């Protein structure tokens, strides 16, 4: 899963994926 491997390799990514997963995070950064 692209979006997840990524956003686990960028520390306000993941963090921000703790709270409102990896897809939300992943488009906030990476849209």
């Given at each position: 899963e692209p979006k997840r491997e990524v956003c686990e390799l960028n520390p306000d990514?993941?963090?921000?994926?703790?709270?409102?997963?990896?897809?939300?995070?992943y488009r906030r950064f990476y849209g």
């Open positions: 990514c993941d963090e921000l994926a703790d709270h409102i997963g990896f897809q939300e995070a």
